[PDB]
Amino acid sequence: CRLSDQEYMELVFENGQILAKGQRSNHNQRTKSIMDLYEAEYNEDFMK
């Protein structure tokens, strides 16, 4: 039950069938809450 991000997929025609092969077959899953991600990424420290 993770939020994740929209992953796009492309139709290919193989073995006499139309299969929606994914782009990147994918470790290091997220282990921190979205609150921690917001507090880390939105860090305006390099503007000193």
Partner 1 sequence: ESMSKAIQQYTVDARLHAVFEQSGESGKSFDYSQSLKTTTYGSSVPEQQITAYLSRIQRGGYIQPFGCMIAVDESSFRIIGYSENAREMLGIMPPEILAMGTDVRSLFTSSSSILLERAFVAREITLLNPVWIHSKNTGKPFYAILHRIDVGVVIDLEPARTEDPALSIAGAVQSQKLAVRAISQLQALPGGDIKLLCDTVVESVRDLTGYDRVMVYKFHEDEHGEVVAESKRDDLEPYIGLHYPATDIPQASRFLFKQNRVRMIVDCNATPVLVVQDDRLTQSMCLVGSTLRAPHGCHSQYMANMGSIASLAMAVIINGNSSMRLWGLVVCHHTSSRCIPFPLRYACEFLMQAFGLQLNMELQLALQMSEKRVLRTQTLLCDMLLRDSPAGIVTQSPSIMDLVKCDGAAFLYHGKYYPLGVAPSEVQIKDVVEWLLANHADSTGLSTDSLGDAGYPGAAALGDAVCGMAVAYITKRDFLFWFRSHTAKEIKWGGDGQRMHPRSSFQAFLEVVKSRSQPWETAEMDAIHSLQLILRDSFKES
What is the contact surface with partner 1 in residues (CB under 8 A)? 1-13, 16-18, 20, 23-24, 28-30, 33-38, 41-42, 44, 46-47
Give the C-alpha distances (Å, rounded to integers) separating 2 from 13, 14, 16, 28: 31, 32, 35, 13
Paired with 18 in beta bridges are: 13
CB of 22 to partner 1, least distance (A): 9
CB of 9 to partner 1, least distance (A): 7
Q: SS3 for 40?
A: helix
Query: Closest approach of Cβ 13 to partner 1, in Å?
Result: 5
